JSON list of C-alpha atoms in Angstrom, two decimals:
[
{"chain": "A", "resi": 102, "resn": "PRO", "atom": "CA", "xyz": [0.00, 0.00, 0.00]},
{"chain": "A", "resi": 103, "resn": "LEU", "atom": "CA", "xyz": [1.32, 3.41, -1.06]},
{"chain": "A", "resi": 104, "resn": "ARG", "atom": "CA", "xyz": [1.20, 6.40, 1.33]},
{"chain": "A", "resi": 105, "resn": "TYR", "atom": "CA", "xyz": [1.37, 9.70, -0.56]},
{"chain": "A", "resi": 106, "resn": "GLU", "atom": "CA", "xyz": [0.81, 12.12, 2.30]},
{"chain": "A", "resi": 107, "resn": "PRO", "atom": "CA", "xyz": [0.19, 15.73, 1.18]},
{"chain": "A", "resi": 108, "resn": "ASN", "atom": "CA", "xyz": [3.42, 17.75, 1.18]},
{"chain": "A", "resi": 109, "resn": "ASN", "atom": "CA", "xyz": [3.84, 21.44, 0.39]},
{"chain": "A", "resi": 110, "resn": "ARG", "atom": "CA", "xyz": [6.98, 20.78, -1.67]},
{"chain": "A", "resi": 111, "resn": "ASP", "atom": "CA", "xyz": [4.88, 18.52, -3.95]},
{"chain": "A", "resi": 112, "resn": "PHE", "atom": "CA", "xyz": [3.25, 20.77, -6.55]},
{"chain": "A", "resi": 113, "resn": "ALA", "atom": "CA", "xyz": [2.48, 17.85, -8.90]},
{"chain": "A", "resi": 114, "resn": "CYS", "atom": "CA", "xyz": [-1.27, 18.30, -8.98]},
{"chain": "A", "resi": 115, "resn": "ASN", "atom": "CA", "xyz": [-3.41, 15.68, -10.71]},
{"chain": "A", "resi": 116, "resn": "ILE", "atom": "CA", "xyz": [-5.97, 16.52, -13.39]},
{"chain": "A", "resi": 117, "resn": "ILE", "atom": "CA", "xyz": [-7.06, 13.01, -14.46]},
{"chain": "A", "resi": 118, "resn": "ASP", "atom": "CA", "xyz": [-9.25, 12.84, -11.35]},
{"chain": "A", "resi": 119, "resn": "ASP", "atom": "CA", "xyz": [-10.66, 16.18, -12.50]},
{"chain": "A", "resi": 120, "resn": "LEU", "atom": "CA", "xyz": [-11.47, 15.01, -16.02]},
{"chain": "A", "resi": 121, "resn": "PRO", "atom": "CA", "xyz": [-14.72, 12.99, -16.00]},
{"chain": "A", "resi": 122, "resn": "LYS", "atom": "CA", "xyz": [-14.21, 9.24, -16.04]},
{"chain": "A", "resi": 123, "resn": "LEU", "atom": "CA", "xyz": [-14.83, 7.30, -19.23]},
{"chain": "A", "resi": 124, "resn": "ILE", "atom": "CA", "xyz": [-17.71, 4.92, -19.98]},
{"chain": "A", "resi": 125, "resn": "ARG", "atom": "CA", "xyz": [-17.87, 1.61, -21.83]},
{"chain": "A", "resi": 126, "resn": "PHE", "atom": "CA", "xyz": [-20.22, 0.58, -24.63]},
{"chain": "A", "resi": 127, "resn": "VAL", "atom": "CA", "xyz": [-21.80, -2.86, -24.24]},
{"chain": "A", "resi": 128, "resn": "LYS", "atom": "CA", "xyz": [-24.80, -4.13, -26.21]},
{"chain": "A", "resi": 129, "resn": "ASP", "atom": "CA", "xyz": [-27.12, -6.79, -24.80]},
{"chain": "A", "resi": 130, "resn": "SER", "atom": "CA", "xyz": [-29.69, -8.73, -26.83]},
{"chain": "A", "resi": 131, "resn": "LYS", "atom": "CA", "xyz": [-32.53, -6.25, -26.24]},
{"chain": "A", "resi": 132, "resn": "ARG", "atom": "CA", "xyz": [-30.79, -2.94, -27.02]},
{"chain": "A", "resi": 133, "resn": "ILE", "atom": "CA", "xyz": [-27.42, -1.20, -26.79]},
{"chain": "A", "resi": 134, "resn": "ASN", "atom": "CA", "xyz": [-26.72, -0.10, -23.22]},
{"chain": "A", "resi": 135, "resn": "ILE", "atom": "CA", "xyz": [-23.98, 2.07, -21.72]},
{"chain": "A", "resi": 136, "resn": "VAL", "atom": "CA", "xyz": [-22.22, 1.34, -18.42]},
{"chain": "A", "resi": 137, "resn": "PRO", "atom": "CA", "xyz": [-19.49, 3.02, -16.34]},
{"chain": "A", "resi": 138, "resn": "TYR", "atom": "CA", "xyz": [-15.94, 2.15, -17.35]},
{"chain": "A", "resi": 139, "resn": "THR", "atom": "CA", "xyz": [-14.07, -0.43, -15.27]},
{"chain": "A", "resi": 140, "resn": "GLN", "atom": "CA", "xyz": [-10.53, -1.62, -15.90]},
{"chain": "A", "resi": 141, "resn": "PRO", "atom": "CA", "xyz": [-10.21, -5.33, -16.78]},
{"chain": "A", "resi": 142, "resn": "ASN", "atom": "CA", "xyz": [-8.14, -6.03, -13.65]},
{"chain": "A", "resi": 143, "resn": "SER", "atom": "CA", "xyz": [-9.89, -3.45, -11.45]},
{"chain": "A", "resi": 144, "resn": "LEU", "atom": "CA", "xyz": [-12.40, -5.96, -10.06]},
{"chain": "A", "resi": 145, "resn": "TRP", "atom": "CA", "xyz": [-9.76, -7.68, -7.91]},
{"chain": "A", "resi": 146, "resn": "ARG", "atom": "CA", "xyz": [-7.82, -4.43, -7.41]},
{"chain": "A", "resi": 147, "resn": "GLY", "atom": "CA", "xyz": [-10.64, -1.98, -6.69]},
{"chain": "A", "resi": 148, "resn": "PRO", "atom": "CA", "xyz": [-10.82, -0.24, -3.32]},
{"chain": "A", "resi": 149, "resn": "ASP", "atom": "CA", "xyz": [-12.32, -2.86, -1.04]},
{"chain": "A", "resi": 150, "resn": "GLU", "atom": "CA", "xyz": [-15.52, -1.84, 0.71]},
{"chain": "A", "resi": 151, "resn": "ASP", "atom": "CA", "xyz": [-13.71, -3.29, 3.75]},
{"chain": "B", "resi": 344, "resn": "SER", "atom": "CA", "xyz": [-29.93, 43.97, -36.67]},
{"chain": "B", "resi": 345, "resn": "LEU", "atom": "CA", "xyz": [-29.44, 47.70, -36.16]},
{"chain": "B", "resi": 346, "resn": "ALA", "atom": "CA", "xyz": [-28.29, 46.87, -32.63]},
{"chain": "B", "resi": 347, "resn": "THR", "atom": "CA", "xyz": [-25.87, 44.34, -34.14]},
{"chain": "B", "resi": 348, "resn": "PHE", "atom": "CA", "xyz": [-24.67, 46.93, -36.66]},
{"chain": "B", "resi": 349, "resn": "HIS", "atom": "CA", "xyz": [-23.92, 49.44, -33.91]},
{"chain": "B", "resi": 350, "resn": "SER", "atom": "CA", "xyz": [-21.89, 46.82, -32.04]},
{"chain": "B", "resi": 351, "resn": "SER", "atom": "CA", "xyz": [-20.10, 46.10, -35.32]},
{"chain": "B", "resi": 352, "resn": "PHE", "atom": "CA", "xyz": [-18.82, 49.70, -35.41]},
{"chain": "B", "resi": 353, "resn": "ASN", "atom": "CA", "xyz": [-17.90, 49.68, -31.68]},
{"chain": "B", "resi": 354, "resn": "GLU", "atom": "CA", "xyz": [-20.67, 52.14, -30.80]},
{"chain": "B", "resi": 355, "resn": "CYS", "atom": "CA", "xyz": [-21.61, 49.89, -27.85]},
{"chain": "B", "resi": 356, "resn": "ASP", "atom": "CA", "xyz": [-23.60, 52.43, -25.84]},
{"chain": "B", "resi": 357, "resn": "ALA", "atom": "CA", "xyz": [-25.82, 53.38, -28.78]},
{"chain": "B", "resi": 358, "resn": "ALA", "atom": "CA", "xyz": [-26.57, 49.69, -29.35]},
{"chain": "B", "resi": 359, "resn": "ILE", "atom": "CA", "xyz": [-27.79, 49.34, -25.75]},
{"chain": "B", "resi": 360, "resn": "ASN", "atom": "CA", "xyz": [-30.57, 51.91, -26.18]},
{"chain": "B", "resi": 361, "resn": "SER", "atom": "CA", "xyz": [-31.65, 50.32, -29.47]},
{"chain": "B", "resi": 362, "resn": "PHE", "atom": "CA", "xyz": [-31.73, 46.85, -27.91]},
{"chain": "B", "resi": 363, "resn": "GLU", "atom": "CA", "xyz": [-33.86, 48.02, -24.97]},
{"chain": "B", "resi": 364, "resn": "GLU", "atom": "CA", "xyz": [-36.79, 48.91, -27.23]},
{"chain": "B", "resi": 365, "resn": "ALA", "atom": "CA", "xyz": [-36.51, 45.44, -28.79]},
{"chain": "B", "resi": 366, "resn": "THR", "atom": "CA", "xyz": [-37.56, 43.77, -25.54]},
{"chain": "B", "resi": 367, "resn": "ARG", "atom": "CA", "xyz": [-40.63, 45.99, -25.20]},
{"chain": "B", "resi": 368, "resn": "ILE", "atom": "CA", "xyz": [-41.74, 45.29, -28.78]},
{"chain": "B", "resi": 369, "resn": "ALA", "atom": "CA", "xyz": [-41.33, 41.55, -28.20]},
{"chain": "B", "resi": 370, "resn": "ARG", "atom": "CA", "xyz": [-43.77, 41.67, -25.27]},
{"chain": "B", "resi": 371, "resn": "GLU", "atom": "CA", "xyz": [-46.45, 43.40, -27.36]},
{"chain": "B", "resi": 372, "resn": "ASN", "atom": "CA", "xyz": [-46.35, 40.52, -29.85]},
{"chain": "B", "resi": 373, "resn": "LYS", "atom": "CA", "xyz": [-46.93, 38.09, -26.95]},
{"chain": "B", "resi": 374, "resn": "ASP", "atom": "CA", "xyz": [-45.00, 35.35, -28.77]},
{"chain": "B", "resi": 375, "resn": "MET", "atom": "CA", "xyz": [-42.62, 33.09, -26.84]},
{"chain": "B", "resi": 376, "resn": "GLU", "atom": "CA", "xyz": [-40.33, 31.90, -29.67]},
{"chain": "B", "resi": 377, "resn": "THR", "atom": "CA", "xyz": [-38.85, 35.35, -30.31]},
{"chain": "B", "resi": 378, "resn": "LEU", "atom": "CA", "xyz": [-37.83, 35.93, -26.68]},
{"chain": "B", "resi": 379, "resn": "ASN", "atom": "CA", "xyz": [-35.32, 33.07, -26.82]},
{"chain": "B", "resi": 380, "resn": "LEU", "atom": "CA", "xyz": [-33.76, 34.84, -29.80]},
{"chain": "B", "resi": 381, "resn": "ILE", "atom": "CA", "xyz": [-33.64, 38.09, -27.80]},
{"chain": "B", "resi": 382, "resn": "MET", "atom": "CA", "xyz": [-31.98, 36.39, -24.82]},
{"chain": "B", "resi": 383, "resn": "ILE", "atom": "CA", "xyz": [-29.46, 34.61, -27.05]},
{"chain": "B", "resi": 384, "resn": "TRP", "atom": "CA", "xyz": [-28.44, 37.93, -28.60]},
{"chain": "B", "resi": 385, "resn": "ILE", "atom": "CA", "xyz": [-28.07, 39.44, -25.11]},
{"chain": "B", "resi": 386, "resn": "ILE", "atom": "CA", "xyz": [-25.05, 37.54, -23.86]},
{"chain": "B", "resi": 387, "resn": "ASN", "atom": "CA", "xyz": [-23.48, 37.23, -27.31]},
{"chain": "B", "resi": 388, "resn": "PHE", "atom": "CA", "xyz": [-23.18, 41.00, -27.09]},
{"chain": "B", "resi": 389, "resn": "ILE", "atom": "CA", "xyz": [-21.93, 40.49, -23.53]},
{"chain": "B", "resi": 390, "resn": "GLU", "atom": "CA", "xyz": [-19.41, 37.89, -24.72]},
{"chain": "B", "resi": 391, "resn": "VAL", "atom": "CA", "xyz": [-17.82, 40.39, -27.09]},
{"chain": "B", "resi": 392, "resn": "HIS", "atom": "CA", "xyz": [-18.04, 43.28, -24.58]},
{"chain": "B", "resi": 393, "resn": "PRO", "atom": "CA", "xyz": [-17.96, 41.81, -21.04]},
{"chain": "B", "resi": 394, "resn": "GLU", "atom": "CA", "xyz": [-17.50, 45.29, -19.53]},
{"chain": "B", "resi": 395, "resn": "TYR", "atom": "CA", "xyz": [-21.22, 46.02, -20.09]},
{"chain": "B", "resi": 396, "resn": "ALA", "atom": "CA", "xyz": [-22.61, 43.08, -18.08]},
{"chain": "B", "resi": 397, "resn": "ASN", "atom": "CA", "xyz": [-23.78, 45.40, -15.30]},
{"chain": "B", "resi": 398, "resn": "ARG", "atom": "CA", "xyz": [-25.68, 47.78, -17.60]},
{"chain": "B", "resi": 399, "resn": "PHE", "atom": "CA", "xyz": [-28.20, 45.15, -18.72]},
{"chain": "B", "resi": 400, "resn": "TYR", "atom": "CA", "xyz": [-31.52, 44.69, -16.93]},
{"chain": "B", "resi": 401, "resn": "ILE", "atom": "CA", "xyz": [-30.82, 40.94, -16.62]},
{"chain": "B", "resi": 402, "resn": "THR", "atom": "CA", "xyz": [-27.66, 39.46, -15.15]},
{"chain": "B", "resi": 403, "resn": "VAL", "atom": "CA", "xyz": [-25.85, 36.80, -17.17]},
{"chain": "B", "resi": 404, "resn": "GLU", "atom": "CA", "xyz": [-26.41, 34.11, -14.53]},
{"chain": "B", "resi": 405, "resn": "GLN", "atom": "CA", "xyz": [-30.18, 34.64, -14.73]},
{"chain": "B", "resi": 406, "resn": "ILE", "atom": "CA", "xyz": [-30.27, 33.68, -18.41]},
{"chain": "B", "resi": 407, "resn": "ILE", "atom": "CA", "xyz": [-28.24, 30.48, -17.95]},
{"chain": "B", "resi": 408, "resn": "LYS", "atom": "CA", "xyz": [-30.60, 29.31, -15.21]},
{"chain": "B", "resi": 409, "resn": "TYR", "atom": "CA", "xyz": [-33.53, 29.94, -17.57]},
{"chain": "B", "resi": 410, "resn": "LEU", "atom": "CA", "xyz": [-32.04, 28.39, -20.70]},
{"chain": "B", "resi": 411, "resn": "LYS", "atom": "CA", "xyz": [-30.92, 25.19, -18.96]},
{"chain": "B", "resi": 412, "resn": "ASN", "atom": "CA", "xyz": [-34.52, 24.32, -17.99]},
{"chain": "B", "resi": 413, "resn": "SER", "atom": "CA", "xyz": [-36.22, 26.05, -20.92]},
{"chain": "B", "resi": 414, "resn": "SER", "atom": "CA", "xyz": [-37.89, 22.91, -22.34]},
{"chain": "B", "resi": 415, "resn": "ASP", "atom": "CA", "xyz": [-37.14, 19.39, -23.57]},
{"chain": "B", "resi": 416, "resn": "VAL", "atom": "CA", "xyz": [-38.31, 19.80, -27.19]},
{"chain": "B", "resi": 417, "resn": "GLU", "atom": "CA", "xyz": [-38.28, 22.45, -29.94]},
{"chain": "B", "resi": 418, "resn": "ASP", "atom": "CA", "xyz": [-34.93, 23.84, -28.78]},
{"chain": "B", "resi": 419, "resn": "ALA", "atom": "CA", "xyz": [-32.21, 21.87, -30.61]},
{"chain": "B", "resi": 420, "resn": "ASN", "atom": "CA", "xyz": [-29.55, 24.59, -30.49]},
{"chain": "B", "resi": 421, "resn": "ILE", "atom": "CA", "xyz": [-30.62, 26.62, -27.44]},
{"chain": "B", "resi": 422, "resn": "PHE", "atom": "CA", "xyz": [-28.95, 24.18, -25.04]},
{"chain": "B", "resi": 423, "resn": "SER", "atom": "CA", "xyz": [-25.79, 24.09, -27.16]},
{"chain": "B", "resi": 424, "resn": "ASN", "atom": "CA", "xyz": [-25.66, 27.87, -26.81]},
{"chain": "B", "resi": 425, "resn": "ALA", "atom": "CA", "xyz": [-26.66, 27.88, -23.14]},
{"chain": "B", "resi": 426, "resn": "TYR", "atom": "CA", "xyz": [-23.90, 25.60, -21.85]},
{"chain": "B", "resi": 427, "resn": "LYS", "atom": "CA", "xyz": [-21.20, 27.35, -23.89]},
{"chain": "B", "resi": 428, "resn": "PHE", "atom": "CA", "xyz": [-21.95, 30.59, -22.06]},
{"chain": "B", "resi": 429, "resn": "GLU", "atom": "CA", "xyz": [-21.75, 28.83, -18.69]},
{"chain": "B", "resi": 430, "resn": "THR", "atom": "CA", "xyz": [-18.30, 27.52, -19.63]},
{"chain": "B", "resi": 431, "resn": "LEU", "atom": "CA", "xyz": [-17.05, 31.04, -20.35]},
{"chain": "B", "resi": 432, "resn": "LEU", "atom": "CA", "xyz": [-18.55, 32.41, -17.15]},
{"chain": "B", "resi": 433, "resn": "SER", "atom": "CA", "xyz": [-17.02, 29.52, -15.20]},
{"chain": "B", "resi": 434, "resn": "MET", "atom": "CA", "xyz": [-13.61, 29.98, -16.84]},
{"chain": "B", "resi": 435, "resn": "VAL", "atom": "CA", "xyz": [-13.61, 33.71, -16.07]},
{"chain": "B", "resi": 436, "resn": "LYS", "atom": "CA", "xyz": [-14.84, 33.04, -12.51]},
{"chain": "B", "resi": 437, "resn": "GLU", "atom": "CA", "xyz": [-11.74, 30.79, -12.09]},
{"chain": "B", "resi": 438, "resn": "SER", "atom": "CA", "xyz": [-13.97, 28.06, -10.73]},
{"chain": "B", "resi": 439, "resn": "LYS", "atom": "CA", "xyz": [-12.53, 24.68, -9.83]},
{"chain": "B", "resi": 440, "resn": "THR", "atom": "CA", "xyz": [-11.29, 22.90, -12.92]},
{"chain": "B", "resi": 441, "resn": "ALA", "atom": "CA", "xyz": [-13.65, 20.07, -11.89]},
{"chain": "B", "resi": 442, "resn": "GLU", "atom": "CA", "xyz": [-16.72, 22.11, -12.86]},
{"chain": "B", "resi": 443, "resn": "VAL", "atom": "CA", "xyz": [-15.11, 23.72, -15.93]},
{"chain": "B", "resi": 444, "resn": "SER", "atom": "CA", "xyz": [-14.33, 20.36, -17.54]},
{"chain": "B", "resi": 445, "resn": "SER", "atom": "CA", "xyz": [-17.83, 19.08, -16.78]},
{"chain": "B", "resi": 446, "resn": "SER", "atom": "CA", "xyz": [-19.47, 22.22, -18.17]},
{"chain": "B", "resi": 447, "resn": "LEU", "atom": "CA", "xyz": [-17.29, 22.10, -21.29]},
{"chain": "B", "resi": 448, "resn": "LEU", "atom": "CA", "xyz": [-18.15, 18.41, -21.64]},
{"chain": "B", "resi": 449, "resn": "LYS", "atom": "CA", "xyz": [-21.85, 19.27, -21.76]},
{"chain": "B", "resi": 450, "resn": "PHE", "atom": "CA", "xyz": [-21.31, 21.97, -24.40]},
{"chain": "B", "resi": 451, "resn": "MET", "atom": "CA", "xyz": [-19.06, 19.69, -26.46]},
{"chain": "B", "resi": 452, "resn": "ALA", "atom": "CA", "xyz": [-21.38, 16.67, -26.23]},
{"chain": "B", "resi": 453, "resn": "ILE", "atom": "CA", "xyz": [-24.49, 18.46, -27.51]},
{"chain": "B", "resi": 454, "resn": "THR", "atom": "CA", "xyz": [-22.65, 20.38, -30.25]},
{"chain": "B", "resi": 455, "resn": "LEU", "atom": "CA", "xyz": [-21.15, 17.26, -31.84]},
{"chain": "B", "resi": 456, "resn": "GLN", "atom": "CA", "xyz": [-24.36, 15.24, -31.37]},
{"chain": "B", "resi": 457, "resn": "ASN", "atom": "CA", "xyz": [-26.22, 17.28, -33.98]},
{"chain": "B", "resi": 458, "resn": "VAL", "atom": "CA", "xyz": [-24.60, 18.41, -37.23]},
{"chain": "B", "resi": 459, "resn": "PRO", "atom": "CA", "xyz": [-21.45, 20.49, -36.61]},
{"chain": "B", "resi": 460, "resn": "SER", "atom": "CA", "xyz": [-21.01, 21.34, -40.29]},
{"chain": "B", "resi": 461, "resn": "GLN", "atom": "CA", "xyz": [-24.29, 23.26, -40.61]},
{"chain": "B", "resi": 462, "resn": "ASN", "atom": "CA", "xyz": [-23.77, 25.07, -37.28]},
{"chain": "B", "resi": 463, "resn": "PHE", "atom": "CA", "xyz": [-20.36, 26.41, -38.27]},
{"chain": "B", "resi": 464, "resn": "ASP", "atom": "CA", "xyz": [-20.54, 29.33, -35.82]},
{"chain": "B", "resi": 465, "resn": "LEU", "atom": "CA", "xyz": [-20.79, 27.27, -32.63]},
{"chain": "B", "resi": 466, "resn": "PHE", "atom": "CA", "xyz": [-18.27, 24.66, -33.80]},
{"chain": "B", "resi": 467, "resn": "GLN", "atom": "CA", "xyz": [-15.66, 27.39, -34.22]},
{"chain": "B", "resi": 468, "resn": "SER", "atom": "CA", "xyz": [-16.58, 28.73, -30.77]},
{"chain": "B", "resi": 469, "resn": "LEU", "atom": "CA", "xyz": [-16.04, 25.25, -29.32]},
{"chain": "B", "resi": 470, "resn": "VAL", "atom": "CA", "xyz": [-12.53, 25.11, -30.77]},
{"chain": "B", "resi": 471, "resn": "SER", "atom": "CA", "xyz": [-11.75, 28.64, -29.56]},
{"chain": "B", "resi": 472, "resn": "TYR", "atom": "CA", "xyz": [-12.78, 27.72, -26.01]},
{"chain": "B", "resi": 473, "resn": "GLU", "atom": "CA", "xyz": [-11.12, 24.30, -25.95]},
{"chain": "B", "resi": 474, "resn": "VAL", "atom": "CA", "xyz": [-7.86, 25.66, -27.36]},
{"chain": "B", "resi": 475, "resn": "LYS", "atom": "CA", "xyz": [-8.09, 28.35, -24.67]},
{"chain": "B", "resi": 476, "resn": "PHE", "atom": "CA", "xyz": [-9.06, 25.85, -21.96]},
{"chain": "B", "resi": 477, "resn": "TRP", "atom": "CA", "xyz": [-6.20, 23.46, -22.66]},
{"chain": "B", "resi": 478, "resn": "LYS", "atom": "CA", "xyz": [-3.65, 26.25, -23.18]},
{"chain": "B", "resi": 479, "resn": "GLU", "atom": "CA", "xyz": [-4.28, 27.59, -19.67]},
{"chain": "B", "resi": 480, "resn": "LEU", "atom": "CA", "xyz": [-3.67, 24.07, -18.35]},
{"chain": "B", "resi": 481, "resn": "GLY", "atom": "CA", "xyz": [-0.29, 24.11, -20.11]},
{"chain": "B", "resi": 482, "resn": "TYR", "atom": "CA", "xyz": [-0.74, 21.25, -22.61]},
{"chain": "B", "resi": 483, "resn": "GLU", "atom": "CA", "xyz": [0.09, 22.80, -25.98]},
{"chain": "B", "resi": 484, "resn": "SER", "atom": "CA", "xyz": [0.02, 19.30, -27.48]},
{"chain": "B", "resi": 485, "resn": "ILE", "atom": "CA", "xyz": [-3.76, 19.10, -26.99]},
{"chain": "B", "resi": 486, "resn": "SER", "atom": "CA", "xyz": [-4.15, 22.74, -28.06]},
{"chain": "B", "resi": 487, "resn": "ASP", "atom": "CA", "xyz": [-2.17, 22.15, -31.26]},
{"chain": "B", "resi": 488, "resn": "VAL", "atom": "CA", "xyz": [-4.57, 19.43, -32.43]},
{"chain": "B", "resi": 489, "resn": "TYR", "atom": "CA", "xyz": [-7.62, 21.64, -31.93]},
{"chain": "B", "resi": 490, "resn": "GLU", "atom": "CA", "xyz": [-5.77, 24.68, -33.30]},
{"chain": "B", "resi": 491, "resn": "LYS", "atom": "CA", "xyz": [-5.71, 23.09, -36.77]},
{"chain": "B", "resi": 492, "resn": "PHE", "atom": "CA", "xyz": [-9.53, 23.21, -36.73]},
{"chain": "B", "resi": 493, "resn": "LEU", "atom": "CA", "xyz": [-9.83, 26.89, -35.78]},
{"chain": "B", "resi": 494, "resn": "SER", "atom": "CA", "xyz": [-10.83, 28.92, -38.83]},
{"chain": "B", "resi": 495, "resn": "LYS", "atom": "CA", "xyz": [-8.95, 32.10, -39.71]},
{"chain": "B", "resi": 496, "resn": "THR", "atom": "CA", "xyz": [-10.46, 35.27, -41.22]},
{"chain": "B", "resi": 497, "resn": "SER", "atom": "CA", "xyz": [-13.95, 33.86, -40.60]},
{"chain": "B", "resi": 498, "resn": "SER", "atom": "CA", "xyz": [-14.34, 35.79, -37.30]},
{"chain": "B", "resi": 499, "resn": "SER", "atom": "CA", "xyz": [-18.00, 36.15, -36.24]},
{"chain": "B", "resi": 500, "resn": "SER", "atom": "CA", "xyz": [-20.98, 38.46, -36.62]},
{"chain": "B", "resi": 501, "resn": "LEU", "atom": "CA", "xyz": [-21.60, 41.64, -34.58]},
{"chain": "B", "resi": 502, "resn": "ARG", "atom": "CA", "xyz": [-17.82, 42.08, -34.07]},
{"chain": "B", "resi": 503, "resn": "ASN", "atom": "CA", "xyz": [-16.53, 44.49, -36.74]},
{"chain": "B", "resi": 504, "resn": "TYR", "atom": "CA", "xyz": [-15.13, 43.20, -40.03]},
{"chain": "B", "resi": 505, "resn": "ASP", "atom": "CA", "xyz": [-11.38, 43.90, -39.72]},
{"chain": "B", "resi": 506, "resn": "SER", "atom": "CA", "xyz": [-11.20, 42.13, -36.34]},
{"chain": "B", "resi": 507, "resn": "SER", "atom": "CA", "xyz": [-9.65, 39.12, -38.08]},
{"chain": "B", "resi": 508, "resn": "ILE", "atom": "CA", "xyz": [-6.91, 41.32, -39.57]},
{"chain": "B", "resi": 509, "resn": "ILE", "atom": "CA", "xyz": [-6.16, 42.84, -36.16]},
{"chain": "B", "resi": 510, "resn": "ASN", "atom": "CA", "xyz": [-6.06, 39.44, -34.46]},
{"chain": "B", "resi": 511, "resn": "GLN", "atom": "CA", "xyz": [-3.52, 38.09, -36.95]},
{"chain": "B", "resi": 512, "resn": "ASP", "atom": "CA", "xyz": [-1.50, 41.28, -36.44]},
{"chain": "B", "resi": 513, "resn": "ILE", "atom": "CA", "xyz": [-1.33, 40.82, -32.65]},
{"chain": "B", "resi": 514, "resn": "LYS", "atom": "CA", "xyz": [0.17, 37.33, -33.00]}
]
């Protein structure tokens, strides 16, 4: 686990968080639906609810 | 149109008096469709001359709140115009870049959804904002790609005719 505590000397702000997250396109049999984007390996790496 | 012509010659103040009588005449007709045209022309004059935002009888924020929830049908291009003006106000207000990207996303998404070729005016305005938005962030690489789509010498209505020549001269 990485610990990036906020430091004043660190001016490397992030803007990816700022940009809206992408979405996937998946079509089921009924119609074409649209779902939030999830990385292929994010299911076992996502922030645990625990 | 006479109000637009006065703004074209940088009269500014004379255009304001002419525009005021346009609102009163619109009420006498008691037709709703023309008022949206009046309101759209309001801030477009404000966009060119932001120093006159106080003189108007309606603040800029009041229009955006109206145009966002104007209707769900028979608008087409009103929402594309409405969100673009919010993005400029947000950029000038130096709001958090979180809201600015989201507001610009709305304006971009609706503009490209319908035909961008026919609505050449707004498509150029999208590029002008996006090239400005990404240049302030410091990523000229993104700005360069959109810069190739910005049209030169086309300029826009109600802003002179030699404005394009002056703009190329400044650079």
